[PDB]
Amino acid sequence: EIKRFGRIREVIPLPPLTEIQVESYKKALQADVPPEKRENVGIQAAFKETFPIEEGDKGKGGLVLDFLEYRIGDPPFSQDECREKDLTYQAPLYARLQLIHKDTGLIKEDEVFLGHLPLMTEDGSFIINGADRVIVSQIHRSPGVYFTPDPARPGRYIASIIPLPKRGPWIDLEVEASGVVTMKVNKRKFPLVLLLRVLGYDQETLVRELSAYGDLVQGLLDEAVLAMRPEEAMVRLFTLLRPGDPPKKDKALAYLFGLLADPKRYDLGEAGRYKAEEKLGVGLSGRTLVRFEDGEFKDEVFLPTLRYLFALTAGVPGHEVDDIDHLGNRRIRTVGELMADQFRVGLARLARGVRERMVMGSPDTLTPAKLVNSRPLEAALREFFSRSQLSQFKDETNPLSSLRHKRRISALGPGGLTRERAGFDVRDVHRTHYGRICPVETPEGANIGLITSLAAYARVDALGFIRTPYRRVKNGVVTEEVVYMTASEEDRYTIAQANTPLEGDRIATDRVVARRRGEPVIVAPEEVEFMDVSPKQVFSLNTNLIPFLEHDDANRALMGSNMQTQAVPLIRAQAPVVMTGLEERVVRDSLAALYAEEDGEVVKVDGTRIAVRYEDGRLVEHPLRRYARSNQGTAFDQRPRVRVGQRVKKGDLLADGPASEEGFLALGQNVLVAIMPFDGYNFEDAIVISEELLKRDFYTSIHIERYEIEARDTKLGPERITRDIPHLSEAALRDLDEEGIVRIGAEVKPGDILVGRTSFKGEQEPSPEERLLRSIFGEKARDVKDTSLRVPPGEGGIVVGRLRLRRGDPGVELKPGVREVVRVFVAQKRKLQVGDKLANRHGNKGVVAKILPVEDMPHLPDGTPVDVILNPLGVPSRMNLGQILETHLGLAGYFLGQRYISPVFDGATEPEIKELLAEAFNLYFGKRQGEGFGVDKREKEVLARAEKLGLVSPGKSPEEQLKELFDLGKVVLYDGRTGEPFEGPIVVGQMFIMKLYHMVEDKMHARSTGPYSLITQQPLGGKAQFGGQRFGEMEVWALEAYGAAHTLQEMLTIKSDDIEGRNAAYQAIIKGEDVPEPSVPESFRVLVKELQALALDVQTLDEKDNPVDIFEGLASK
Amino acid sequence: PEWMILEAVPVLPPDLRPMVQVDGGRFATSDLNDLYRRLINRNNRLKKLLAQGAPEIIIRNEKRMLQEAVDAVIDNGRRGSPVTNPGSERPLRSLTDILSGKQGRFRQNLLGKRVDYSGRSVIVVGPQLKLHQCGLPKRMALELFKPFLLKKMEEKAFAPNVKAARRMLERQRDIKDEVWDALEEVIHGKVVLLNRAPTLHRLGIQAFQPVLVEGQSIQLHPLVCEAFNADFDGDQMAVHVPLSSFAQAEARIQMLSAHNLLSPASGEPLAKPSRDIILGLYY
Amino acid sequence: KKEVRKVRIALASPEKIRSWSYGEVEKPETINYRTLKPERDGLFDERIFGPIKDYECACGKYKRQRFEGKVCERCGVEVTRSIVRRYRMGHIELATPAAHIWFVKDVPSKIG
Amino acid sequence: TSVYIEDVLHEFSTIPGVKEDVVEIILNLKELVVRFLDPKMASTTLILRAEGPKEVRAGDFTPSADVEIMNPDLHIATLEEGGKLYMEVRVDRGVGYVPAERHG
Amino acid sequence: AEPGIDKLFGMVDSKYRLTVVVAKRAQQLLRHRFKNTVLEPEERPKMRTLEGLYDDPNAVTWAMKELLTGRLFFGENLVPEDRLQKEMERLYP
Amino acid sequence: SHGARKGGADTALRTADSGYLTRKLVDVAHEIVVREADCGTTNYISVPLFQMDEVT
Amino acid sequence: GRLIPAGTGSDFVRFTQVVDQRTLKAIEEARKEAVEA
Amino acid sequence: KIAQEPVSLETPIGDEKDSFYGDFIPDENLPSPVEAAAQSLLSEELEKALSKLSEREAMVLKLRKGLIDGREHTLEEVGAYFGVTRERIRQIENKALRKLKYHESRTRKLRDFLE
DNA sequence: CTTGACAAAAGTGTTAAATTGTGCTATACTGGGAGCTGTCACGGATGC
DNA sequence: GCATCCGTGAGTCGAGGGTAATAAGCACAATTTAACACTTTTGTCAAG
RNA sequence: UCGA
Ligand SMILES: [Mg+2]
Ligand SMILES: [Zn+2]
């Protein structure tokens, strides 16, 4: 059965969790959208901005290119096809433009081909270079005007302005304390009355609106300048701000024009114009500062920002300082905004590719056919999707991984902030944050608060203003209005909580929870204005999957969430028997599962393909991808859960997912858990387990790895993938099918070749001993040498994927000078080993310490032993009670088996679970009563000892006492070693855990003697690079602190890069002798010669002041 | 001081400014190369201009470019925006670029470095282990002590000589008792070191008697774990070895864990009972 | 052969620097796009800095250690290990004399 | 211990006409209990055939001497329309519990 | 801990002096294949072995007990390095 | 959550500062090592066990 | 990359020399081989 | 293929600043400790395997295979050494290499180094 | 161990075919070009 | 000497990750390299 | 970017 819980009932479900990536990108798509009627913004803005292109006026050479549509469609290859090809998933985009001569007035229209622009896949993750990647959302303070208290002046106030990043300069209204006012932009200081020159103002209008506020007149007045006129004093600051070029007149009408009036160089987001407009209490249309009207420049922006600034500084109410980190003042860069922006500037590079090319030439043969380029645009957009900070490897570690990852936002990147500049207020959580971004979930490293994750119900409009759903109310009336009230708008009304005294759709108790701006205040049935849909919105995805989360401290909660990201697939995976009930749309919106699109009936199961002929009469099927490799090597599988045939409704799940249990996310398992200090093996957040599960293969998964090799043609001539090797014995040639590659289903130890390759080594005369060695056996010197591709240590198992495409094959392109390439998957079943990372939803980590045999184990009177027995230490220090309550509900619930839905902040409580305990116990004591048993003497003993501290209420019979004890969460356990009970009760039950990504089978590495770096002979690093650890500066220091002189010396010399040191060492130990003393570390010698390149005379002396030769006979010239 | 105006510019050796290819087939190289190159370009072009009696203006300007180029091949960034590989914002790293800085040839290669005969892994509690005891991964230790096992195989029959041992090991995972118990004969006596980053107290690096145990994990005495600033939440500790018998002496004498049991800071005990122990004992 | 207990530092003079060098690097070019052999004067030149191959000359008339240090007459490469490629410097003779930005732009500014 | 099928590459690849994949059919393996009628029989072998749209169970095997199944009702795979599968297994006897990875 | 430590440290003034002692002596033991030493059959630091029980090859432990008796002698500027090292590689192969 | 998250960020950045400190310390007194058993200085500084309680 | 002036390789204690009894008296004699000269 | 130029070693990789390119390149241009001892080994093991050959044919074998001075001496030269015709030196090589072949196929010491 | 005969490996001489380096083009072209931000602390030179 | 600028720093090891794309041309002299012819050396063979 |  499934029983579930909670008081507050969600009035509306969660809008799709995949849209913030898909929809906000889709807005800049305009795919199906007609070529004529379009949105003018997004990708269409990227066109209308860079168009129309023109050089001339009516004159000798004129040219004008004007914009028409960019055919969307024709994807070259489907997702899967692109992924195996290493090609980007993309599609041709077709721009139709007209080339009109200024002179003849002859319109010559031509449609051209821009290039291949990557298109979005289904779940919202693009495929670039054959690899699934993702664009993480970006965040920055929304464009507009702002007002803060003067950082310099004690009581004064300063203003600021700014558009899209780099797409306009900063502006500041600061009053330096002269009593006069100096505006400052891009490192310079000039009077506020300076810029008013061409602004269309003079001595008059200035004092018209100057004194309308207060004492502010004088500082805004000047004499030595103001006598001048717009085109006269125009050259003043132009002479100043740019000494680089000669201060002409005509060039003061140009260089300044592009700064503001140019819509393309000042381009200001539709949101910036918006918010700043309704902010200053004025109106505007153009996204520029001032328009270019017929010579001089008119005014729109400056007058209002002056009005509001001077107002605020005067102290007239309603004009306040706009909050800095406030969500109402900060927008979100989404996929569409980003891609479209990059399209704008990249296509501007292409605009250079247009205006410049059309005059070197003859207007005779002319058409955008020859005038249009690709690489500036195509490679700009190619650059955005890879090298940028906001685009990286998709999180395929699990479905919920990519989900959450796509729902994460970073203030970092190109035009946000950077690591070097961050304060407290930067990564902090603003008062009005609330139901918008997750207050906890964030990397526990130096990125805490740096990368926040999106909340549940919170949305993002095209304006970047985040809007959290609320609920309107008029005097105790619950309205069906779902209010998306803006952050800035949220600060206005009075907002209650979802936990409000809900009864009879009316207000129950007088005093009610509520707030303004984030300030808690008790309210009355009248002043009630808004409410909350559900507390769910106050957190993110993973954070919402934690039951009784109100009992866990924020730290460990955070850890629990990001660890839910760290989760891996499980073959037998079992969804939490106690969850928050959110897992339904978790598997739906993840798009990792297969459902019924409409009403229909199953025909055939066939774990390859499930064919279901729908009620609509048409024959449709939905095949399945079974056991496919992901980015993290985490296995992707979909298990058909429907019989040979039956009829299903629309939305019913016909197939599982990498972790999906009957339409529920299954991370780990709910297996029996005990809590006690067991032989100190669980010491300090350590774990312990039982072999029993290893039999049942509870946590065991499948991991796949990507193997590849290039056939590249050498300067001595080409290589190839073949089955021949000169010296290879028949033994190693086994698994190769017929052509020199490993077949499907063959086990490979981590010595074993997958793909063989053959080359020819450069010709060098064998050393004398080698010459003779070659002579005795007469071994042919086969000019072909083995290039074969082996497998790394620790990675071994069977083989599934085998794909090889040579040069010239259908739908493939290779590198310039390569012949073939081979790619093989290696699949391996990994059972959970000793030392692996495991953790729960409540944020308690650990590693496996010594799995105990099924024999010995703290069983119960039913003889059922436990599976973990986790130590009770990390609980009080790290303060998480959620795992405790979860374990109790699992205690009473294992007997019942029914599920538990405990939504965050609303769910099971002490009385409920108490009744569950009493219930399960009644039926348990029943279980032993009719089966011919009674109270165990050992249990009598434990109850007696517990009765001393009042753990069980005295005077009551041991039956009732065990009822109480069992109710407390703890029962009687018998040591599986001795058979004797334990001095006191031990809380046990069913609790949810997880098998973390980090696996000892991988992380573990060692090297004796490997290769070295080219520059300096210092050994390599990394694992697959086969390299040793480095000894840090602090390591060195500690080593000195011990006072081990030689250990340190050998470390820095013989043991690391020393010239003959390492060699003579290997010699020594190989011969059993003792390693001699080293001479030069050899990184040192490099240092010396570097200093020589700096003409630093490097003189190494000796016991008394004499040149020592550090380089033996080396440079004596 | 006239030397500060130096005429002949020292050129760094080619192998110090490496250029070599890879499996991909393309060639790579350092930045200093390109710097040197463009420099010589300017110098030579200047030389071709001077003798032919070029106008004084172009000459002077070329000398300007000479100074700026040289000084760029030294301190690049000390004057103006540094010269970069054309089209890429990545600045060309000069001499002074490598000599100083975090990852510079100083702090990165002379005050610390990658070392041979090492490796690391996860950590697991040691309740059976003594103060001088560490669980050592099987496979790790095999590919750790490989020279030692080589000589041990030289002494103890099974293969005639040195190379035979190597090739009888690296190929075929055939870890059968010939090895598993010989490495043992070399194991006793000399001990190795364990370190848990960060290295704060010297006790962050201690030494333990190697004991080979089945697994890929690492066992360590629960009490000194505190001194290493390490809990069991999934940490990773690194292991190495004091090759020289002198350095080995050092390792077992003052470097051994069982030896320094007190705080070098507070003079108070170090490994004193922790968590569970205290719990049981007290109760 | 001798303990090094002391490390000095000083200013290298032009003549000294010349003595450090095994030759002037003329053609500012890596190698041939075909042969991958160090260019005639190219920065990677094995003819002055050191042989591309251990104990060998360039053209290959001296392939062996039987000739030690003897300069090849068909090539002009000292027959020796390629090790010297790391320890042997060059120099560039600058037409017009040029200072060094170090003691110039540094805080104390020696020359200034 | 031992399992073979004329149709498969490995422990994974999905057999047509069979709902569960191979390793799931293996989930149904170790959960199968079988006793021999002889104390002296070390190893053995078993043969299985299920064609058509009929399911597969421990009882569907080919009975023989010295073999008895204790759970004929054990579900193996739900075979869809016309699923054809051949199967064979060596069920041996030993002591304790040894994972597949430690024995060949 | 390593058996017989407290006394060892109790001998040399410098905690480090001991290390120098141990190092040099032990290395000398590896030089001659253990025929130098002042340890008799009962004092031979035998190591436990499944195969057969032999003397521990490690020079360090050997050095430990070697000084543990005190039969050795340690001092600075004891004798000129010449005759010191020349007669050591003579007596034993 | 406000308060806590603030705390966490704090501790992190402060770890970085710790690294700063320590390194700098190892670059000054590092050249100091106990050498002369007794230098022979007659100097010394007394350290009273008596600390004044403020405002008390 | 040399011997650190402190620790075991200190310029105080690295001078310490050790001899076993047999070889001790072996050299303790041969020092007197120079009394005839 | 010729088009693309050498890639800078200073190219930062990964998501960080500190992850570089240049120090990720292996140095194979120089011998390795395992290779040093391997070469020294073949040298020594063959050096002792030398004495089991006829005092004349061993010395001769050191020429034809280019051992002594490193430069291979032709049949005519070794013949001009022992005062024997080059044909003699030839059959000397046959019988020497085969006698060694007996000792090899028996001892199985140098059976390694088979690449 | 050696002599003559002879096949192939190797040496050398001379050319054809490729690769590479150089000079020049004439209506008139005559002072670039690209932007960027949300630290922080202290030490020094330098402009008040 | 008083405010205001260039200058130098800022935590440990790791796990991975990665791969890429602008620009004039034509005749001709000067060599370089590939081709070819043929002498000699050297290694093999038949048979003293 | 994520572990510790
Ligand atoms: Mg830890
Ligand atoms: Zn030569």
Q: What is the dihedral of CA A1072, A1077, A1083, A1089, to 10 degrees?
A: -140
Euclidean distance between CA atoms A116 and A123, whole angstroms: 21
What letter does residue A494 receive in the DSSP assignment? -
Token pair of A169, please? Answer: 């300069």
The answer as to whether H37 is a domain residue is yes
A427 and A367 both lie in a single domain: yes
CA of A1037 to C1' of J12 (A): 13
Of the three residues A979, A1003, A1027, the one that is the final residue of a domain is A1003
3-state secondary structure B201-243: CHHHEEEECEEEECCCCEEECCCCCCCCCCCCCCCEEEEECCC
Task: Say which residues have a Cβ less than 8 Å from residue E37's Cβ, sequence separation at least 6.
Answer: E29, E62, E66, G20
CA-derived radius of gyration, chain H: 24
Residue at which a domain ends, from A534, A553, A582? A534
CATH number for the domain harbouring residue B230: 2.40.40.20
Residue A66 phi/psi, 5° resolution? -120, 150
The distance of C34 to chain B (nearest Cα, Å) reads 13
Provide CB contacts within 8 A for D79, sequence distance 6+: A644, D17, D18, D19, D50, D52, D53, D54, D55, D56, D85
User: Are B207 and B256 in contact, with CB atoms under 8 Å apart?
Assistant: yes
A856 and A999 in one domain? yes
| Residue-range domain boundaries for chain E | 1-93
Using alpha carbons only, give the angle A484, A487, A491 rounded to the nearest 5 degrees.
Answer: 110
Residue A56: both structure tokens together: 């001339």
Residues A331 and A230 in one domain: no
Question: Which contacts (CB < 8 Å, 24+ apart) does range H36-42 have?
Answer: H36/A1063, H36/A1066, H36/A1067, H37/A1063, H37/A1066, H37/A1067, H37/A1070, H37/B162, H38/B163, H38/B166, H38/H113, H39/A767, H39/A769, H40/A1067, H41/B161, H41/B162, H41/B163, H42/A769, H42/A770, H42/A773, H42/B163, H42/H110, H42/H113
The number of beta carbons lying within 10 Å of the beta carbon of residue A607 is 26
In a domain? residue H36: yes
Task: Quickly list DSSP for A368-380.
Answer: HHHH--SHHHHHH
Dist. CA A434–CA A429, nearest whole Å:
9
Question: Positive or negative CA dihedral for A406, A409, A413, A415?
Answer: positive
The angle, 0 to 180 degrees and rounded to 10, between the axes of the packed helices H75-82 and H55-64 is: 150
Rounded to whole angstroms, the Cα distance separating A350 from B185 reads 73
Among C36, C57, C64, C84, the residue to mutate for chain H (most H Cβ within 10 A): C64
A837 shares a domain with A718: no
* Distance, CA of A86 to CA of A97 (rounded, Å): 33
SS3 state at A692? helix
Where residue A155 sits, what CATH number does that domain have? 3.90.1110.10
Q: For residue A111, how many other CB atoms are within 10 A of its CB?
A: 16
Parallel/antiparallel/unpaired status of strands B236-240 and B192-195: antiparallel
Best of A388, A774, A782, A1063 to mutate (most H CBs within 10 Å, chain H): A1063
Local structure of A351: helix, strand or coil: helix
Cα-based distances in Å from A26 to A75, A123, A124, A342, G20: 16, 13, 10, 16, 87
Report the top-level CATH class of E1-93: alpha beta
Any domain includes H47 = yes
The Cα–Cα gap between A180 and A193 comes to 10
Q: Please, are residues A837 and A844 in contact by the beta-carbon 8 Å criterion?
A: no
Transcribe A298-332 into DSSP letters.
Answer: --SSHHHHHHHHHHHHHT-TT--PPPSS-GGGEEE
B234-253 residues near strand J (Cβ < 7 Å): 236, 238
Residues A121 and A153 in one domain: no
A420 CB less than 7 Å from any atom of strand K: no
Amino acid at A524: A
- H-state helical runs in A27-176: 45-50, 79-85
Alpha carbon distance A598, A606 (integer Å):
20
CB < 8 Å to G7, chain A: 1040, 1042-1045, 1048
- C-alpha separations of A1009 from A86, A1066, H114 in Å: 35, 9, 21
CA of B230 to the centre of ligand 1 (A): 4
The residue written with tokens 């420049």 in the block is: A297
Measured between alpha carbons, how far is H104 from A776 in angstroms, rounded to an integer?
9
**Whole-angstrom distance, CA of residue A955 vs CA of residue A121:** 69
Residue G17 dihedral angles phi and psi, to the nearest 5°: -115, 145
Number of domains in chain A: 7
CA distance B279 to B282: 5
What strands lie across the sheet with A700-710, from one edge to the other?
A700-710, A821-831, A798-804
A1017 and chain H in contact, CB less than 8 A: yes
Give CA–CA dist A186/A183, Å, rounded. 10
Chains touching A (at least 3 CB pairs under 8 A) are B, C, D, E, F, G, H
Resolution of the coordinates, Å: 4.3
Does residue H76 reach within 7 angstroms of strand I, measured from its CB? Answer: no
Structure tokens at A836: 């692996």
> E strand or H helix at A938, and its extent?
helix A937-946
Q: How many residues does chain A have?
A: 1117
Residue E78 contacts G where some CB pair is shorter than 8 Å: yes
One domain for residues A479 and A450 = no
CA-based nearest distance G9→chain F, Å: 12
Show me where the domains of chain D are located: 1-104
Q: Which helix (H) or strand (E) holds C24?
A: strand C21-24
Highest CATH level, class, for D1-104: mainly beta
- List subunits contacting chain B, requiring 3 or more Cβ pairs under 8 Å: A, C, E, G, H
Residue type, A263: P
| A541, A616: one domain | no
Taking CB atoms and an 8 Å limit, are A1046 and B173 in contact across chains? no
A898: number of CA atoms within 13 Å, CB side? 13
Q: What is the CATH number of the domain that holds H95?
A: 1.10.10.10
User: CA-to-CA distance for A942 and A925, rounded, in angstroms?
Assistant: 17
Q: Are A126 and A135 in contact (CB under 8 A)?
A: yes
Protein residue with the closest CA to the C1' atom of nucleotide I19:
C34
The alpha carbon of residue D19 and the mean position of all alpha carbons in its chain are separated, in whole angstroms, by 15
Stretch (H or E) spanning B141: helix B138-144
Residue ranges making up the domain that contains B235: 115-259
CA distances from A291 to A254, A260, A331, A807 (A): 13, 8, 26, 57
Experimental method: X-ray
CB H14 within 8 Å of CB H78: no
The string of DSSP letters for H17-70 reads SS--SGGG-B--SS--HHHHHHHHHHHHHHHHTTTTS-HHHHHHHHHHTT-SSS
Tokens of C27: 């053609």
Centre a 10 Å sphere on the Cβ of residue A956 and count the other Cβ atoms it contains.
14
Q: What span, in angstroms and rounded, lies between the C-alpha atoms of G6 and G12?
A: 8
Of A970, A1003, A1036, the domain-final residue = A1003
For chain H, what's the residue count?
A: 115
Residue with tokens 């072998």: D45
In strand K, the nucleotides that come within 7 Å of a protein beta carbon are 1-4
Chain F residues in contact with A442 (beta carbon < 8 A) = 5
Give the pair of three-digit tokens for residue A269: 């987001």
Q: Is residue H2 a part of any domain in this protein? A: no
Query: In the β-sheet with A530-532, what is the strand arrangement from edge to edge?
Result: A482-483, A470-472, A530-532, A495-496, A514-516, A519-520
Paired strand residues for A70:
A95
Same domain assignment for residues A514 and A610 = no
Token readout for F51 is 């600390």
φ, ψ for residue B276, nearest 5 deg: -45, -60
* Cβ pair C33:H2 closer than 8 A: yes
Residues 799-818 of A with CB under 7 A from strand J: 815-816
Spell out which residues of chain D touch residue A798, defining contact as CB-CB under 8 Å. Answer: 10-12
Max Cα distance, chain E (Å): 45
Q: For residues A1000 and D102, give the distance between their C-alpha atoms in angstroms, rounded to a whole number.
A: 18
| Those residues with Cβ within 8 angstroms of residue F30's Cβ, 6 or more apart along the chain or in another chain | none
Q: Residue A336: which of A491, A190, A209, A464 has the closest Cα?
A: A464
| Residue pair C23/C90 in contact by the 8 Å Cβ criterion | yes
Region at A838 (left for phi over 0; alpha for psi -120 to 50; beta for the rest): beta
3-class SS at C62? coil
Substitution target in B206, B231, B274, B276 with the highest count of A β-carbons within 10 Å is B276
Domain with A511 in it: 469-534
